[PDB]
Write a protein that binds this ligand. Structure first.
Ligand code: CA
Length: 356
């Protein structure tokens, strides 16, 4: 499939480039992810973005701190509106932290997953007939372990006190987020609950040019930990690495690969602070955060194809083996000290194996 989105051809190398893209044109002839729900645990969402609306469920805001969520209370509320995660001053988040504009990070991630495609508007997405369930866990200066833990439980269909039952349990969870420290008992239990409910959990390896075993949920047992590659198919300068990384996806090499080839492109805003301070747009970003949703969306394409054929969806362990086993080996040498999994996720190879 060669869709008509205006900026797809020139910008979206991560979809279609022969050496760094995930072979989406060919996968899209088999599956677009219809019927599957991907939960995006992130900064929240711009719910009326015109290239997203239509593929979004209402979702939920798990941030239990008014100063972080920028809401009027510490409650968790229905809906996932991103209020903006800008930080006005250096050092507000921690000693050494730097002021920055709002990221609209979860709208970017959600676009990778399911940006409306072949609609004559903007950019494309991978699982463009799936639904995104947006679950806001990150705000000003980030988020809290126990909000992220609970969001996992709820997104995968488990019960969380104070939150109404999730009417749309997710086949896949994406976590384009992490922190310092190897996996703790709280994260692992939450992850374990999600797996026991049939949910595949896909996470970003992290961007510290460091061993993924030192970060979470990168280092947690049972998840699909995703490294970052360049348009060239080589490791990015920032990708974490190590035996915990299962495979990679396009993260964008950064300025070394220029504009547009250094960046992943999707739905966003140019707003600096609140949503109202700017307008809907398309942004280019780099990180393992951008690689992870490509993998999470491929998992969605596969569950959807299996169901469409009346076959049984894969359990989490099977899904992870499949993604790993069908990854395209790197077109450029990966340094021995920094392994980033079996290869670059290949949506078409993943589909061909699953379907027989
Ligand atoms: Ca579009």
């Amino acid at each position: 499939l060669a869709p008509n989105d205006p900026y797809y051809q020139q910008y979206q190398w991560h979809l279609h480039n022969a050496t760094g893209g995930i072979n989406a044109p060919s996968a899209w002839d088999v599956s677009q992810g219809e019927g599957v729900v991907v939960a995006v645990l992130d900064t929240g969402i711009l719910p009326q973005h015109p290239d997203l609306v239509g593929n979004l469920l209402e979702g939920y805001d798990f941030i239990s701190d008014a100063e972080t969520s920028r809401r009027a209370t510490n409650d968790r509320v229905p809906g996932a509106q991103d209020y903006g995660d800008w930080v006005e001053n250096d050092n507000e988040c921690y000693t050494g932290s730097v002021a920055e504009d709002s990221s609209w990070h979860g709208t970017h991630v959600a676009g990778t997953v399911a940006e409306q495609t072949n609609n004559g508007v903007g950019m494309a997405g991978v699982a463009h007939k799936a639904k995104v369930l947006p679950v806001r866990v990150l705000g000003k200066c980030g988020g809290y372990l126990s909000d992220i833990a609970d969001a996992i439980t709820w997104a995968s269909g488990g019960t969380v006190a104070g939150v109404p039952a999730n009417a749309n349990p997710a086949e896949v969870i994406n976590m384009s987020l992490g922190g310092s420290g190897s996996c703790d008992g709280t994260y692992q239990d939450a992850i374990n609950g999600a797996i026991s409910r049939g949910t595949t959990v896909v996470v970003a390896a992290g961007n510290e040019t460091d061993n993924a075993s030192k970060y979470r949920p990168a280092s947690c047992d049972g998840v699909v930990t995703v490294g970052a590659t360049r348009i060239t198919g080589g490791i990015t300068y920032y990708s974490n690495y190590g035996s915990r990384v299962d495979l990679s996806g396009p993260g964008g090499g950064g300025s070394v690969d220029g504009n547009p080839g250094g960046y992943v492109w999707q739905s966003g805003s140019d707003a600096a602070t609140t949503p109202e301070s700017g307008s809907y747009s398309y942004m280019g970003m780099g990180g393992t955060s951008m690689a992870s949703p490509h993998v999470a969306a491929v998992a969605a394409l596969v569950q959807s194809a299996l169901i469409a054929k009346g076959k049984d969806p894969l359990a989490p362990a099977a899904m992870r083996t499949l993604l790993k086993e069908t990854a395209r080996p790197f077109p450029v040498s990966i340094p021995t000290a920094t392994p980033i999994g079996t290869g670059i996720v290949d949506a078409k190879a993943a589909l061909a194996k699953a379907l027989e």
